[PDB]
């Protein structure tokens, strides 16, 4: 499962 | 340094109306959600988007659109209001799971049949007693508002130009003055004690506002009573050595 | 209803504790939060938690076990700051928050010296009538609901005035007929005993 | 044996000629399983592996979603770190990310990875305490700071340590067949003269699961890593890998040099004389 | 920007032997940025159907990718890989050796 937690950078 | 905000705030529409509520956020957060509060279901999601452009419905859609033109604003559209879509309705943005979602302020709707129940309300406001200040040494001050519907009202109390958070105290819900009926009006009551030498100062000005929110310009008033628009109505009273 | 919050209305004494629980019907969940809704305002985050365990910030104590899907809230040393509606979240098998019902947390205050009395107040100029004020009564008295169908008594709601550190109960009956005084209103409740009158 | 899931992220940004482009491929071990494609038209989670299409259309529906995500993250990112460096507005650029857990036989836990990059250069990189993080550059800090700030260790942790590892256990037992199984390489030799003085002899594998293997030449017992041609481990299409090596060899000499086949699903390793 | 020069092998799924099918496999791998055109060539001409790997990266940040068509050997045909990428001054050329 995807899983990639996205804030921003 | 979160930053959610919602527009309008307060409103009121007939049924068969567009209502469009717009929510603007400033924290580069690509997720943005628009939730309805009632009681007994708590919050639930209407719809949400994952990022400008994508609009993705959720568990209660129906009856509602939406539109996400940038990252920043994301708009409920309420194409033909029913009365079943009076709620509190809050937008909340984040960032895929997503430490927290931030809310925002929440906008009170209420979807009424027709215009002609829509009251501003009257205000008074009652002095303190001398028995209270002979045996307390202290002086409460009550405001009331009454025949007000619908219910969106906001009480506050000034001294002497002022806003006064203490001492202060306003009804959690307002009361029905006939409840068996539909539709029925409203009154709210508030509480303001200060100490009994401060109430003895005649320089000393006090004043009750209570902010109606109703009617807008852009609705169509057809009755002969004023528009009750939404306005400001206010009571006051002076200090007195007596 | 996937997330089942209990209980529904708590009412805990001021100083006290107070113990909420929520649980999940998916299993599908991996995460779990609490947020505080104070009356009219928006919901903000208080607690987080996803691994099995406890986890203490202040008087804030959460608890989470993944097999039975409980999570469990617990507010130690309560102060009428706190009192607001709390709601469960939880992850979704996407992920988005399921949220709850939520749970009322009444913290009644600590009424140092009660001094209960009823007093008749006036109109500022004569745009109305008269009212009756029930105040400086203790937690424990209960305000009952009017009776008289031509007069309305409002709920029960405690004041402060900070400067002094002094916190006040207060209720008000109002009736538009003249027959209508203080000694005989605010019978339908149980007002105390050294209640003064005028 | 100790298990493991990848997924890597890739997205070009296209300026003026469109969008950015996002590719997202996922890897049980060695074995692709997902694939999405964000200039196709399927604009969907599609499966690469037979042991993944048993999963239901919810499965396809919530990884959809899942993965589009990430190219909107990855949109706004690709501006952000333009700014940060200063790059001109009409270039293209690569975010590349790597994220996973590894189990180990019992099934358990034994790490997890999350690692960013731009332009083919590390970017920031969860540490192996799935607690903190690493920057490359001055302007990897300026996303440290935020992501330190919202949490984000704690976020990929939770997936890491929790949903990563279910669902790699549940795709290992949707796959016994094909992914717990080893397939021992099919290993011979060959011999093309180069002159009528010197001879190339190649040791091959062929068809060989996993990728890891190691070939070695020897002349009586010694290594001659030196004088030998190693070629990459490369596919061959059917989920299988191949892998050749060469020496070169005197004329009457050929019967001094081993090749030396290492390789997990070989009991004991091969020697390989011509 | 560190841009790095694709690494081509040319090969066949199977021992090449003729008049039986078999696939032919161009892996260009060690490569950035992703950007790149390879072509499968058939005695200096392009082949029509190849398909094609999915995108993916190595350790070291570096894209590899797998093309492949199905075709049979003969012992006449020449097949080579065109390979152009911005590291390459001229499109690069590797003829199929068999055995390599």
Known sequence: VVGAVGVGK | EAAVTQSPRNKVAVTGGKVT?????????????????????????????????STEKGDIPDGYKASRPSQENFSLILELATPSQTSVYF???????????????????????????????????????????????????????????????????????????????????PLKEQPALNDSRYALSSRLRVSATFWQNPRNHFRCQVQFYGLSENDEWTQDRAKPVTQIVSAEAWGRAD | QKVQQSPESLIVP????????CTSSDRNVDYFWWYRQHSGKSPKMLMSIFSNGEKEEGRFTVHLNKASLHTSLHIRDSQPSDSALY?????????????????????????????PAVYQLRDSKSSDKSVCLFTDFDSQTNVSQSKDSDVYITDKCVLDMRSMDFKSNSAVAWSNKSDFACANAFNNSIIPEDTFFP | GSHSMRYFYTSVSRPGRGEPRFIAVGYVDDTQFVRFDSDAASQRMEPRAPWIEQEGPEYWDQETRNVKAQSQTDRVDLGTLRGYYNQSEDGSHTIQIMYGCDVGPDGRFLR???????????????????????????AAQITKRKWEAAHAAEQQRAYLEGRCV?????????????????????????????????????????????????????????????????????????????????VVVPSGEEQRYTCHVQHEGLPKPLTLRW | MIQRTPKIQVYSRHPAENGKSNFLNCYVS?????????????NGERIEKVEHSDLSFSKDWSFYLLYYTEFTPTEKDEYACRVNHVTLSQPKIVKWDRDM
Request: proline share 5%.
């Open chain 2, 21 to 53: 509520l717009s929510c603007n956020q400033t924290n580069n957060h690509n997720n943005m959600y628009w939730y309805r509060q009632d009681t007994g279901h708590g919050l639930r999601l209407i719809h949400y988007s994952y990022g400008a452009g």
């Open chain 2, 91 to 173: 937008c909340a943005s984040g960032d895929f799971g997503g430490y927290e979602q931030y809310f925002g302020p929440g906008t009170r709707l209420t979807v009424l049949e027709d215009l002609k129940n829509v009251f501003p309300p009257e205000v008074a406001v009652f002095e303190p007693s001398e028995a209270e200040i002979s045996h307390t040494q202290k002086a409460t001050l009550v405001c009331l508002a009454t025949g007000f519907y619908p219910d969106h009202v906001e009480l506050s109390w000034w001294v002497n130009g002022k806003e006064v958070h203490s001492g202060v105290c306003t009804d959690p819900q």
């Open chain 3, 14 to 21: 001021e100083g006290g504790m107070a113990s909420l629980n």
């Open chain 3, 87 to 115: 709601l469960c979240a939880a992850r979704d098998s996407n992920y988005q928050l399921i949220w709850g019902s939520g749970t009322k947390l009444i913290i009644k205050p600590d009424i140092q010296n009660p001094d």
């Open chain 4, 112 to 138: 997890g990875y999350r690692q960013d990059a731009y332009d083919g250069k590390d970017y920031i990189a969860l540490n192996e305490d799935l607690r903190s993080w690493t920057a490359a550059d001055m």
């Open chain 4, 166 to 246: 279910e669902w790699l256990r549940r795709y290992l037992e949707n796959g016994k067949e094909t992914l717990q199984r080893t397939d021992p390489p099919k290993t011979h030799m060959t011999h093309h003269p180069i002159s009528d003085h010197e001879a190339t002899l190649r040791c091959w594998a062929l068809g060989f699961y996993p990728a890891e293997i190691t070939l070695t030449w020897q002349r009586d017992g010694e290594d001659q890593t030196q004088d030998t041609e190693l070629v990459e481990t490369r596919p061959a299409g059917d989920g299988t890998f191949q892998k050749w090596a060469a």
């Open chain 5, 30 to 42: 060690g490569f950035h940025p992703s950007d790149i055109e390879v072509d499968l060539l058939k």
